[PDB]
Amino acid sequence: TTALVCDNGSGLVKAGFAGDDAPRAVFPSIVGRPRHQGVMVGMGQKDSYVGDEAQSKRGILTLKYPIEHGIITNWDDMEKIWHHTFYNELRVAPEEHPTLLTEAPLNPKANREKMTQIMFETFNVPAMYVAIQAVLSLYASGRTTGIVLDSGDGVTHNVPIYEGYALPHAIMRLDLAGRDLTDYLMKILTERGYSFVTTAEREIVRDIKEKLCYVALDFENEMATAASSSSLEKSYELPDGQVITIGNERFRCPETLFQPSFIGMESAGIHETTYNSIMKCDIDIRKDLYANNVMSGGTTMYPGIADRMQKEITALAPSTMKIKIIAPPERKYSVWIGGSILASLSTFQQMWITKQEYDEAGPSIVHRKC
Amino acid sequence: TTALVCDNGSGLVKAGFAGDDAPRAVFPSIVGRPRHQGVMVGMGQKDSYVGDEAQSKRGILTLKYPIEHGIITNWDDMEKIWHHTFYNELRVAPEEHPTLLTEAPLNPKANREKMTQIMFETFNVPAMYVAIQAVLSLYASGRTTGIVLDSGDGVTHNVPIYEGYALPHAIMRLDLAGRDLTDYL
Amino acid sequence: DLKGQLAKLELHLNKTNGQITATERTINYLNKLKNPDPKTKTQLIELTEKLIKLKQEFETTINSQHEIS
Amino acid sequence: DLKGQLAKLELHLNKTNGQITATERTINYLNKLKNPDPKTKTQLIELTEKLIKLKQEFETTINSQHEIS
Numbered sequence: 235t236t237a238l239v240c241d242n243g244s245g246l247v248k249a250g251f252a253g254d255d256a257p258r259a260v261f262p263s264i265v266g267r268p269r270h271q272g273v274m275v276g277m278g279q280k281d282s283y284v285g286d287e288a289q290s291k292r293g294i295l296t297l298k299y300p301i302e303h304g305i306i307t308n309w310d311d312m313e314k315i316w317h318h319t320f321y322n323e324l325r326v327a328p329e330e331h332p333t334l335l336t337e338a339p340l341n342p343k344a345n346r347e348k349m350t351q352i353m354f355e356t357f358n359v360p361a362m363y364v365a366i367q368a369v370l371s372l373y374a375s376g377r378t379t380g381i382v383l384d385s386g387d388g389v390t391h392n393v394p395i396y397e398g399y400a401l402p403h404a405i406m407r408l409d410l411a412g413r414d415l416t417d418y419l420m421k422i423l424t425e426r427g428y429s430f431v432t433t434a435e436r437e438i439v440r441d442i443k444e445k446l447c448y449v450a451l452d453f454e455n456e457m458a459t460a461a462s463s464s465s466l467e468k469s470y471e472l473p474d475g476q477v478i479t480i481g482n483e484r485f486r487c488p489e490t491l492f493q494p495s496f497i498g499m500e501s502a503g504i505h506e507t508t509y510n511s512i513m514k515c516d517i518d519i520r521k522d523l524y525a526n527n528v529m530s531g532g533t534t535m536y537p538g539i540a541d542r543m544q545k546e547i548t549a550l551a552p553s554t555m556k557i558k559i560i561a562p563p564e565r566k567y568s569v570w571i572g573g574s575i576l577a578s579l580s581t582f583q584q585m586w587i588t589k590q591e592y593d594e595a596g597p598s599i600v601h602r603k604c
Numbered sequence: 605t606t607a608l609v610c611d612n613g614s615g616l617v618k619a620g621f622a623g624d625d626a627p628r629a630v631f632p633s634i635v636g637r638p639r640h641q642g643v644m645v646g647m648g649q650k651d652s653y654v655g656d657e658a659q660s661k662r663g664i665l666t667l668k669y670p671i672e673h674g675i676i677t678n679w680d681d682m683e684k685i686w687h688h689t690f691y692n693e694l695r696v697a698p699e700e701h702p703t704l705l706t707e708a709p710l711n712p713k714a715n716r717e718k719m720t721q722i723m724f725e726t727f728n729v730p731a732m733y734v735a736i737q738a739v740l741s742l743y744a745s746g747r748t749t750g751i752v753l754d755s756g757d758g759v760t761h762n763v764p765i766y767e768g769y770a771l772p773h774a775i776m777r778l779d780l781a782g783r784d785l786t787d788y789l
Numbered sequence: 790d791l792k793g794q795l796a797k798l799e800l801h802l803n804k805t806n807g808q809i810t811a812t813e814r815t816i817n818y819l820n821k822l823k824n825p826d827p828k829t830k831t832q833l834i835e836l837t838e839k840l841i842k843l844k845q846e847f848e849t850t851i852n853s854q855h856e857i858s
Numbered sequence: 859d860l861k862g863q864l865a866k867l868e869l870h871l872n873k874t875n876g877q878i879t880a881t882e883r884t885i886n887y888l889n890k891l892k893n894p895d896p897k898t899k900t901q902l903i904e905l906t907e908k909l910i911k912l913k914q915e916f917e918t919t920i921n922s923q924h925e926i927s
């Protein structure tokens with residue numbers, strides 16, 4: 235049999251089978267509800283569209299996100315997403331195969347229990363397991379000693395591991411991610427005249443973000459160059475056949491990652507969190523973590539993030555130490571690529587939580603290995 | 605045959621064969637136990653590292669010393685050290701050859717008996733001998749009349765000998781050694 | 790018929806490459822281990838053999854596809 | 859081949875020197891004695907002869923190693 239490896243994310247859902255190199259299906263995790271009357275007769279009355287069809291018909295829908303900052307807020311919508319993924323998208327009955335899910339570190343306990351109950355009582359899978367998102371990245375990378383820097387939508391976290399002994403006191407968590415960058419892009423695009431308010435307009439701004447953005451190696455010099463000349467300008471086309479012309483905002487959106495004071499937050503940029511995590515471990519292992527940094531998640535695909543990260547860490551860290559930022563391509567799916575590998579391993583095939591085990595022990599079972 | 609000459613010390617282990625000029629293997633006498641959870645699968649679990657690998661991975665281990673002030677405190681860890689020395693390090697079965705050990709003067713009697721039992725019942729060496737650390741120094745020095753001042757880690761002792769007649773009432777023992785200097789540093 | 794069978798050969802080649810990628814990733818992970826669990830010791834050999842079999846199957850499939858061409 | 863055999867000669871020379879050192883130390887200890895045990899009287903002669911044999915073997919080995927050079 236093949237064991238599904240679903241990765242319920244904060245901004246996308248990637249579902250596939252074990253022993254593959256890419257998710258079988260990938261689609262946004264949104265639920266759209268109709269807003270208007272409906273005048274024609276004979277058309278099917280849909281209470282709510284889910285998945286990609288909602289993204290197709292965003293004009294007359296009120297799109298909502300069941301997940302936010304990793305935590306799950308709405309449960310009916312999440313169950314609808316899971317049903318759509320299992321039946322309509324993957325087209326495989328869930329009873330036959332086990333399943334593997336991923337949850338970010340330091341999340342509330344209740345989340346795990348509710349997930350388990352919804353995956354046992356309602357869907358009736360024969361076995362389920364849940365894993366920390368950061369850890370699975372190291373299987374995909376191919377090493378055992380490192381400091382992953384998973385940065386998904388919603389939240390970003392750092393988890394240092396050494397010789398396969400995760401240090402739990404050095405783990406760091408932070409609520410700066412792609413959604414805040416999208417909101418800031420809207421707020422700063424307001425200056426030139428372009429006003430985006432509704433949710434679908436936010437979806438458009440998200441596409442604008444994805445296509446036209448980059449991270450400057452140095453910020454003040456880039457601002458001076460953009461102000462003096464007019465070479466840092468790009469033209470994009472809306473669905474309405476209108477042309478936006480973006481200038482400085484190309485590198486003021488991602489810059490909030492390194493300067494969280496733009497949004498009014500107070501925490502330090504991501505480089506400082508990485509450095510603090512490294513310096514919260516023991517003295518003897520700091521060199522190895524320095525040597526092997528790792529990035530994951532979609533948000534770390536901005537052109538030029540690796541160079542700035544290396545420069546900042548090198549400036550912060552002492553000399554005589556060599557810093558490398560392992561930033562392989564296709565990092566977007568890295569987390570998922572871990573899970574499939576973890577499923578394949580023969581040893582891991584003994585660590586599931588069978589249904590009868592949950593029936594007997596109770597909800598606490600999952601937390602024993604937490 | 606060649607007779608092993610091991611010197612279980614207080615801060616280092618030196619093991620070798622007879623008729624040589626240096627120990628075949630030398631490594632610290634520590635035992636490290638893991639401290640953290642362990643999250644990766646497949647690595648294969650180990651309860652406790654011993655010898656030099658423990659020194660290599662000191663970041664995530666709780667290093668302990670089986671010996672202290674010459675006396676042996678923990679036995680199950682002193683046996684692990686001996687097994688590692690005989691099989692992994694020297695790579696010679698202990699049954700064929702005899703063995704010679706060294707023990708500081710004025711140590712408790714029970715130590716000697718327990719060492720003997722562990723070296724006969726468990727390892728099954730055909731013959732064992734134990735000697736005082738200070739006396740063996742005089743063979744290396746090349747004289748017979750002198751007052752050795754052996755100062756290892758853990759303890760320091762003085763044993764005066766004259767014409768190969770060790771005076772037992774003049775022996776002196778003191779518990780100042782490298783470990784206390786490290787703590788003071 | 791020729792076009793359809795050529796397309797089927799292309800699909801089979803794509804699937805074979807997709808399998809090779811995953812097997813190579815698993816072997817790349819398993820190599821770094823230093824004291825593997827007894828089960829992993831056998832699984833490594835199994836994957837090493839499966840990789841060879843897939844590579845020869847890929848060679849045969851590409852040769853056939855070219856021969857049709 | 860030349861490099862390998864030169865390395866083997868170097869290893870043999872190192873082993874010979876290591877034996878010479880220990881034999882010299884034992885003879886140095888035994889010399890100081892004044893009324894040695896009857897067994898030690900013969901052992902001293904045996905070691906004295908072994909030292910000479912080792913020294914000529916060392917000379918021959920170094921000569922061969924230089925010749926290869």
Ligand SMILES: Nc1ncnc2c1ncn2[C@@H]1O[C@H](COP(=O)(O)OP(=O)(O)O)[C@@H](O)[C@H]1O
Pocket residue numbers: 243244245246385386387412413440443444531532533534535536566
């Ligand atoms: N090529 C890209 N360049 C810049 N940002 C991107 C790119 N691809 C995705 N993103 C950002 O990452 C987010 C998606 O992250 P995702 O990989 O889904 O994280 P998770 O898997 O944890 O949900 C999107 O909201 C988008 O803003």
Ligand SMILES: Nc1ncnc2c1ncn2[C@@H]1O[C@H](COP(=O)(O)OP(=O)(O)O)[C@@H](O)[C@H]1O
Pocket residue numbers: 613614615616755756757782783
């Ligand atoms: N070169 C050196 N300089 C100063 N102190 C040393 C040196 N070498 C070893 N030591 C000290 O001696 C100790 C080791 O003593 P050792 O020779 O092992 O005695 P024993 O064999 O009785 O344990 C170490 O703890 C170290 O502090």
Ligand SMILES: [Mg+2]
Pocket residue numbers: 243385386387531532569
């Ligand atoms: Mg992610």
Ligand SMILES: [Mg+2]
Pocket residue numbers: 613755756757
């Ligand atoms: Mg000593």
